[PDB]
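User: C-alpha cells for this complex, please. No commentary.
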Amino acid sequence: LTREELRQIAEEDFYEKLAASIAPEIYGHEDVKKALLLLLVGGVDQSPRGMKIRGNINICLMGDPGVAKSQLLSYIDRLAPRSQYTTGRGSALVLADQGVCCIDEFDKMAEADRTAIHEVMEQQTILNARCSILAAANPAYGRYNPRRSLEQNIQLPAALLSRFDLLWLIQDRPDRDNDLRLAQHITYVHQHSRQPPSQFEPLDMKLMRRYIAMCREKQPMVPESLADYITAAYVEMRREAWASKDATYTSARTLLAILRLSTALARLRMVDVVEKEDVNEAIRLMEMSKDSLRPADVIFATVRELVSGGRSVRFSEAEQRCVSRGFTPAQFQAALDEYEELNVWQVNASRTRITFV
Amino acid sequence: KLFSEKRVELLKELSRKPDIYERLASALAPSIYEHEDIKKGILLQLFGGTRKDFSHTGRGKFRAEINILLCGDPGTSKSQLLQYVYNLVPRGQYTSGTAYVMKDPETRQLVLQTGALVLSDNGICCIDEFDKMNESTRSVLHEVMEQQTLSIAKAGIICQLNARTSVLAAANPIESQWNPKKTTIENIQLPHTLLSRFDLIFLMLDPQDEAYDRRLAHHLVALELLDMAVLKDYIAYAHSTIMPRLSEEASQALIEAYVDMRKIGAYPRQLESLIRLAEAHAKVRLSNKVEAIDVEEAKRLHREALKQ
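Assistant:
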C-alpha cells in the first residue's frame, strides 16, 4: 500500500472499524464479523519436528433460515482475493488454494462428500487444498431446538464439528426493540441505497484487501513467557468442558485453534511477537462462540493459622502476628471479643493464653 | 552385502550397550510423549518373530508376524503414529475404514488385481477407525489374521494368495468415552475372535491429571537424528542375518507362565504370541538364543497390558 492509506487504517479503535467494515449492511453480529476478519487474516503455518500444523481458520455458521447467512457468504466471496462460492448440490477445493472456500447448504449434502471433506479439513490435502473452509448449515426442522442436542440439530458427526475451529449460532429470537431497530435500518437501506450512518464510514474493499494481503506477509513468533498462561487457560477451559457433558470435546485441536487465533491477531496488529492481548481476545472469542450454543474474619483466620496441632494459643504470638498483618491492637481486641461472644474460644484473664473451645 | 565392515562394527558397538533397547524406544517418534511401552511394542513388532517351516510335521505354516491393536479417543496420537510408521517402514500401507477381478480387453479373459493387503506382502499395513468398518471386511480379516492366506471362490474363480502382513489397527470406543465398565467389549463392542487373534491390545486413555495436561501443553508449545537412519539398516541387518531359537530354561519359564496365566481367567494363541515376543526381544539384543530375560520381559509387558 501507500503508507498514508495504512495510517488511514490505523486510527483509534481500528480493530472495531475493520470488524464493522465487513458486511456493514447487516446490523449487529460483530462477533461473527471479527471471526470472518480473523479467517481473512489467518494463522501461521509451521512444520516442526516432522509434522505439519495448519494456520487456516475454518468456521461453521449455522442458524435458522433468514438470518442473512447467504449475503454474508456473498460479501466474503467478493472481498476475499481467492474465493470460491459453491452450494451443496451444485458441487472447487483445489481452485480455492491459498484462499477461502465459501460453501452453503452444508447440511443439505450427502455424507459421501462429507467423508472426503474430513481429509481436506485435517491435512489441507486431497494435491494441496490449503484453503479456509467457511460452511453454512441449517436446522433439520427449520428452527433450532435448544431442547435437542447440538449434533442432532446439526445432523453432522461430532468429529466434523470439532474439526471446525469456530462455531457460531445465530437464533431468530423475537425482541420488540431489536425488531424495530432492524426494521428501521432495513428501511433506510432500501430507501437510501446506502448503509445507515454509523460512527465511522467503512473502508473500501480494495483497501481492506491490500491491508489483509500485507498483514498476511508477517510471521509472528510466539514468546515462551505466555506459554504458562496459555497452559493454565487451556486447563481451565478443558476442565469446564469436562464438567459439562454437552460441551464440545476440547482436544488439542482447541489449543491449536486458539494459537491460530492469537497468531492471526498478531498479524492483524502488525507485530512480530504475540502479546497477551491477543491471547485474551482469542479466549474471549472462543468463550463467546461456545456461549452462543471485616477485620474480625481476617483476625480469626490469622489466629486459625496458629492452630497447627494445638488447642491453646499464646496471646503474645497471636498479637504480634495480627499487628504484622496491618491491624491495630484495638481491632484485634474487638475481633477477639466478637468471636468470643460466639464462644468459639475462651481467653484467660491474664491475657496470656487462649483455649479454643 | 549392503553394509561395509565399519557399519557392522558400529552396529555391534551399539548392541553391546545394555541401554540400546530403551534408547531406541526413546528414538521412536520423538514428538510422542510418555508412551514408552507403546514404542517398545512397535519396535518388537518391527523385529517380529522368526520364520519356521513345519513341512515335515504335516502342519500348516504358522504365523510368525506380530499384530497390535490400539483403542482410544479420536484426535490422539493414533493418526500421527500410523503416519509415522507408514512413512518410516518400507513397503508400509495406510488404509482407512482386497483382490478383485478385471477383464482383459484384449483376450476377454478375467484377470486378478491385487489389493493393498496383497501389495503389502512382507510389509506392514495400518488401518484407522477399525470400529467404523463394515462387518463383511472384518469377517474376511479372520482368515488373513490366522492363516496368513486368502481363498476366493466366486464366479468359478478359485485361488489362494499369500498375505504375510502385520496389522496395526486403530479403533474408537462405541461410547466415544471410557464408560466405567469391565470388559473391553462393553466399551468397543468387538467379537471375541478378533480380539483373541490380536497379539497385543493397547488402550489410549486421556487421564484426568493436571500435571499430565501441563506436560502435554509444554510438549506442544516446545515442539535423535543419529538413530532412525542407522536403525532402518540395523533392522534390515537383524532381519537378514540373525534368527533366535528357544532354550530349555525359557521352556520351563513359558510352561509355568501359561499355567499361571490360565488361573487368572487364556488360550494357546496368546502362548504363541508370547513365543513370538520372546523371539522379537532376542532379536533386539542380537542374541541367537532365547534366554530368561526375553521371557521375563515379554511376560512383564503382557501383564502390564492386561493390568492397563
